[PDB]
Paper text:
Phosphorylase kinase ([name]) phosphorylates GP and transforms it from the inactive b form to the active a form to initiate this important biochemical process. The 1.3-megadalton [name] α4β4γ4δ4 hexadecamer consists of a tetramer of tetramer, wherein four αβγδ modules are connected by the central β4 scaffold. The α-subunit serves as a bridge between the β-subunit and the γδ subcomplex, and facilitates the γ-subunit to adopt an autoinhibited state. The γ-subunit bears the catalytic activity and consists of an N-terminal kinase domain (KD) and a C-terminal regulatory domain (CRD).
The δ-subunit or calmodulin is located on the periphery of the [name] holoenzyme and interacts exclusively with the γ-subunit. We also analyzed the cryo-EM structure of active [name] in the presence of Ca2+ and determined the structure at a resolution of 2.9 Å. When compared to the inactive state structure, the most notable difference is that the KD–αJ region of the γ-subunit and calmodulin were no longer visible. The KD was likely detached from the α-subunit–AID platform as a result of this conformational change, providing an explanation for its absence in the density map. Indeed, the active [name] structure clearly reveals the presence of ADP bound to the β-subunits, which can be attributed to the ADP present in the sample buffer. Within the structure, ADP is nestled between the D1β, D2β, and D4β domains. The diphosphate moiety is surrounded by Arg211β, Tyr213β, Arg214β, and Arg274β, which effectively neutralize the negative charges of the phosphate groups and allow the binding of ADP without divalent metal ions. The presence of ADP leads to a slight conformational change of D2β–D5β relative to D1β. Notably, D2β interacts with D2α to establish the α1/β2 and α2/β1 dimers; whereas D2α interacts with the KD N-lobe and contributes to the maintenance of the inactive state of the γ-subunit. The ADP-induced conformational changes in the β-subunits would propagate to the α-subunits through the D2β–D2α interaction, facilitating the disruption of the α-subunit–KD interaction and thereby allosterically enhancing [name] activity. The allosteric ADP site has now been elucidated, revealing that ADP is surrounded by several positively charged residues in the β-subunit, independently of divalent metal ions.
Residue numbers in the entry:
A (entry chain A): 3 to 154, 158 to 212, 231 to 359, 363 to 622, 758 to 771, 778 to 794, 796 to 967, 1051 to 1221
B (entry chain C): 329 to 359, 366 to 382
The structure:
């Protein structure tokens, strides 16, 4: 090997020694960022040791002589030393890991910088924005990979598992990002970056799959966009490619790479993100933050980082390629010291040449500044060279086969065991043909609720010596409660979450349980990427039987018979005894569980209750609010009979009553924070009340269950029977996004109050009735019937007045056209802003929002979609797009903030005159008591000579006539 | 020219094609595709 491969290996040894290993501290093993930046970043240290690890691996695959063994051992032990030093850096902050485990706050996060001479902390928590889930996640990922490569106390194992819990909730934790500045605006605003989420997913996979697939949901929803305030980040290459490989969608990976190439790639590398301005000649060097008005200034002149082209060589090596264009384009290396490449950190447009670069993008000869060499980039450069020259293989750097993520994974067959709670239930199930086994017969396998599984993991990770307290109580979804568990040598199987949660009306409806089971199976068939085959334990309880008790629910039978047939829930299902499923299951072993009016005196007014059960309940709110857990003077309290009333109406299944009792007793869904976190996990915002704006409190970020529940209560303003609707509809939307997320495309802000109003309207026109009696029959809907209404609301299925209904359906669902937000970005260039109901969407937003941001989307949907009425909004949507339509033909720009409502109205006044003349009944046109827009205008089709969009075209042209006196149109 | 958009946006062809395309982008999820088209004033419509 020394003939022609040992000399080149020694050349790379000199490269790594003179670029990386020269700066490693003999005391700590950490690497200072540069001469000026003497501190050691976690992520930079982890990335900078990749070259050393790869060299050691190279040296070892050819280590036969001693000297070669000495070099390989030195390199491998340098890598081990660096990782151990970073460990004591994190170990010294065990009080921060423990605090972030429960309260994921930026003030309780691990520091990014550490003293390279003492493994201590250099700055204060307040001083750097230390929350960077990607640094800890990349450390965990490469700790898993290096160990799987043969690189070697239990206390640090407990600390590492507590770090697993630390980065476990990264799909819902705002971050300061890989660039440790949060959002682009650069005001220290913690933001959810897909880079951190993907790195956390990779670290967890290499090292509980529920939060792993939550991170997967974040990745699918966010890509190709980076985060809320970023169209694209070149750091996404660290997720869709080396080192995370956290995206298993090949199309998504290709789309993200193409977005990076098209938007950020330049002559001297790739810009980190659009309007970055980290080392641009336009920033203020001594000012830490960025004013929202200078972000425009950074456009088209952002610094291009050669570091990202090392990622483009790494993929290309990991995935075989002729991307030998990414190499050969890195001739932009500083010294050819002696001849050391010295990959720069970034290239900045020379200051004088700002105007030329702005105008002519990616064309000016930039200068190198920042760190030189960028050790994070230099290590990746050396690793890619090693890998590309045949001295290394993807399987040596990646012994965990993270690269095989993109390969299509086959559908999984979910084995289900239907277990009888009681033997009588088993007898009924058999009369009907499903042969099952009782929970007693399944012994020695012990069936437990998922609550017990969540509590068991709270004893994982605990060392009281360093004050680490297990894992926080997290709800285990279907993914967690589908593996079999080896606890104290006896196998424990756990039923899904939705079965033991019988505290809200959803569990009483057997159809709901069928629907929850179907959603769980659909989620399992797609998200199970685990060794073994998942096993859903489905016990048929006594509540699952019919009214008589000698027969089983039809819906539950039908579901079980379909599962026996192999298909239910979009999933192939194998039913059988739980004993048969031991050999082909994810039988994980939990080793931590081994031991070792008048008359205001309310003296006698409840006497009227002593049989309609509606009236009995009605009195009971007078006697609750006026008199909830107070006495009744008959060995009874207000709460007690309300619970008795709740049980009675559950037995009679008159759903309006159950909902009301639930509503005034403040029944709350336990897995509701999970529903909100799932809906927000898919990059969909939520608003909770009736539509006028203050009541409708928006949910932009995840909220803890107490807050979420409290936000729901205050959004009803005391008006009952909607606070429960918000939770129930949120749950249904979560299930439908888990199962049929295509239904939720072109939707970005779910207005629950508008949804409820549109369900009431649909119950009013279907089963024609008054809108009000329909608002009351919506109460009397079964939970599964209401879920069906929501399906039909979403998919627009029907059980001269049509176009008003559509305009309503789409507006309530807040459905926007494809490309609508980017089109709004275009008009804001022309006009000075849009005004809806007096609220202004200024053009200054575009000076800090790139068109494809999901932060500009929110800005638009907060000025436009806030309109209470469902249709008025869909018309305001048209008037914007006809404004977008006519902006292209118009050659000039106007200095007015255009009031879209007026264009809607001017079209309204243009609707009376034209229709009256074409000759239509004056009473045929009817104004709206809420919007002042003729009902027939809503009923009008979009296109045509009398189409509503044509009227707005005749309105916008007659609107901008006084603003634009002259209009040399194209 | 503006006057044409004000008077008869539809006849002028280039604009109509745009109007009809915008109708679909927004509302082709509801799709003869004619439902998205209204060439009768509701009176000649509600005549039968
Ligand atoms: C050529 C004139 C029209 C086609 C009338 C409709 C256009 C406008 C009223 C102005 C559009 C320009 C913006 C910046 C919104």
């Amino acid at each position: 090997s020394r003939s022609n491969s040992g000399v080149r290996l020694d050349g790379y040894a000199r490269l790594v020694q003179q670029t990386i290993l020269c700066h490693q501290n003999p005391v700590t093993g950490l690497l200072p960022a540069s001469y000026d930046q003497k501190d050691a970043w976690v992520r930079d240290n982890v990335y900078s040791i990749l070259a050393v690890w790869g060299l050691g691996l190279a040296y070892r695959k050819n280590a036969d002589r001693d000297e070669d063994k000495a070099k390989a051992y030195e390199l491998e032990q340098s890598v081990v030393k660096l990782m151990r030093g970073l460990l004591h850096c994190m170990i010294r902050q065990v009080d921060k890991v423990e605090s972030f485990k429960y309260s994921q706050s930026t003030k309780d996060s691990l520091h990014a910088k550490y003293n390279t001479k003492t493994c201590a902390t250099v700055v204060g928590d307040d001083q750097w924005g230390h929350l960077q889930l990607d640094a800890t996640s990349v450390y965990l990922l490469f700790l898993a990979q290096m160990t799987a490569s043969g690189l070697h106390s239990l206390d640090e194992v407990n600390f590492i598992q507590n770090l697993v819990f630390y980065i476990e909730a990264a799909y819902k934790t705002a971050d300061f990002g890989i660039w440790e500045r949060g959002d682009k605006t650069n005001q220290g605003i913690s933001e959810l970056n897909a880079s951190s989420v993907g790195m956390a997913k990779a670290a967890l996979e290499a090292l509980l799959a529920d939060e792993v697939q939550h991170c997967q949901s974040i990745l699918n929803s966010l890509l190709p966009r980076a985060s809320t305030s970023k169209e694209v980040d070149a750091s996404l290459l660290s997720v869709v490619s080396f080192p995370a490989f956290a995206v298993e969608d090949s199309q998504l990976v290709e789309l993200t790479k193409q977005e990076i190439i098209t938007k950020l790639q330049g002559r001297y590398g790739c810009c980190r993100f659009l309007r970055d301005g980290y080392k641009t000649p336009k920033e203020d060097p001594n000012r830490l933050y960025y004013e929202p008005a200078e972000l425009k200034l950074f456009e088209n002149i952002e610094c291009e980082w050669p570091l990202f082209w090392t990622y483009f060589i790494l993929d290309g090596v990991f995935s075989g390629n002729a991307e030998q264009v990414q190499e050969y384009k890195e001739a932009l290396e500083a010294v050819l010291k002696n001849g050391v490449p010295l990959l720069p950190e970034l290239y900045s447009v020379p200051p004088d040449r700002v105007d030329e670069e702005y105008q002519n993008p990616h064309t000016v000869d930039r200068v190198p500044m920042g760190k030189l060499p960028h050790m994070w980039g230099q290590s990746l450069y050396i690793l890619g060279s090693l890998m590309a020259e045949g001295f290394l293989a993807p399987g040596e750097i990646d012994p965990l086969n993270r690269r095989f993520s993109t390969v299509p994974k086959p559908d999984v067959v979910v084995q289900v065991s239907i277990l009888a709670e009681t033997e009588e239930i088993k007898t009924i199930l058999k009369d009907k043909g499903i042969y099952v086994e009782t929970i007693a017969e399944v012994y020695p396998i012990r069936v437990q609720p998922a609550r017990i599984l969540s509590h068991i993991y709270s004893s994982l990770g605990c060392n009281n010596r360093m004050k680490l307290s297990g894992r926080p109580y997290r709800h285990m979804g279907v993914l967690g409660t589908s593996k079999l568990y080896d606890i104290r040598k006896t196998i424990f199987t756990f039923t899904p979450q939705f079965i033991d949660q019988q505290q809200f009306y959803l569990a009483l409806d057997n159809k709901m349980i069928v629907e929850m089971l179907r959603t769980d199976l659909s989620y399992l068939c797609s998200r199970w990427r685990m060794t073994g085959q998942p096993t859903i334990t489905f016990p048929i309880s006594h509540s699952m039987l019919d009214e008589d008790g000698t027969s089983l629910n039809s819906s539950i039978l039908a579901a079980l018979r379909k599962m026996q047939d192999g298909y239910f829930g979009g999933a192939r299902v194998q039913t059988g005894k739980l004993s048969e499923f031991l050999t082909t299951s994810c039988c994980t072993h939990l080793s931590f569980m081994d031991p070792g009016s008048g008359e205001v005196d309310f003296k006698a007014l409840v006497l009227q209750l002593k049989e309609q059960a509606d009236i009995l309940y009605m009195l009971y709110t007078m006697k609750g609010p006026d008199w909830t857990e107070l006495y009744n003077e008959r060995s009874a309290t207000v709460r007690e009979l309300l619970t008795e009333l709740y049980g009675k109406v559950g037995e009679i299944r008159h759903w309006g009553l159950i909902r009301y009792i639930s509503g005034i007793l403040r029944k709350k869904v336990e897995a509701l924070d999970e529903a909100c976190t799932d809906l927000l996990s898919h990059q969909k915002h939520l608003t909770v009340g009736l539509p006028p704006e203050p009541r409708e409190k928006t949910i932009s970020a995840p909220l803890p269950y107490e807050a979420l529940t409290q936000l729901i209560d205050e959004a009803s303003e005391g008006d009952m029977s909607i606070s429960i609707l918000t939770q129930e509809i949120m749950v249904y939307l979560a299930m439908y996004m888990r199962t049929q997320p295509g239904l939720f495309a072109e939707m970005f802000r779910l207005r629950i109050g508008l949804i409820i109003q549109v369900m009431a309207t649909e119950l009013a026109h279907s089963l024609r009735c008054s809108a009000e009696e329909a608002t009351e029959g919506l109460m009397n809907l079964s939970p599964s019937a209401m879920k069906n209404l929501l399906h039909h609301i979403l998919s627009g299925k029907e059980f001269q007045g049509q176009w008003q209904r559509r305009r309503r359906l789409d507006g309530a669902l807040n459905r926007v056209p494809v490309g609508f937000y980017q089109k709004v970005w275009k008009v804001l260039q022309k006009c000075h802003g849009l005004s809806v109901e007096g609220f202004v969407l200024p053009s200054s937003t575009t000076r800090e929002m790139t068109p494809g941001e999901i932060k500009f989307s929110v800005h638009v949907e907060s000025v436009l979609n806030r309109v209470p009425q469902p249709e008025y909004r869909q018309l305001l949507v048209e008037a914007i797009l006809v404004l977008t339509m006519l902006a292209d033909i118009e050659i000039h720009s106007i200095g007015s903030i255009i009031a879209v409502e007026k264009i809607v109205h001017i079209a309204n006044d243009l609707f009376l005159q034209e229709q009256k003349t074409l000759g239509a009944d004056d009473t045929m046109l009817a104004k709206d008591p809420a919007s002042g827009i003729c009902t027939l205008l809503y009923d009008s089709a979009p296109s045509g000579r009398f189409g509503t969009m044509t009227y707005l075209s005749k309105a916008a042209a007659t609107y901008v006539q006084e603003f634009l006196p002259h209009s040399i149109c194209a | 020219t503006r006057e044409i958009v004000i008077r008869d946006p539809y006849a002028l062809r280039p604009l109509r094609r745009l109007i009809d395309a915008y109708a679909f982008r927004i509302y082709g999820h509801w799709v003869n595709r004619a439902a998205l088209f209204e060439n009768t004033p509701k009176a000649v419509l509600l005549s039968l």
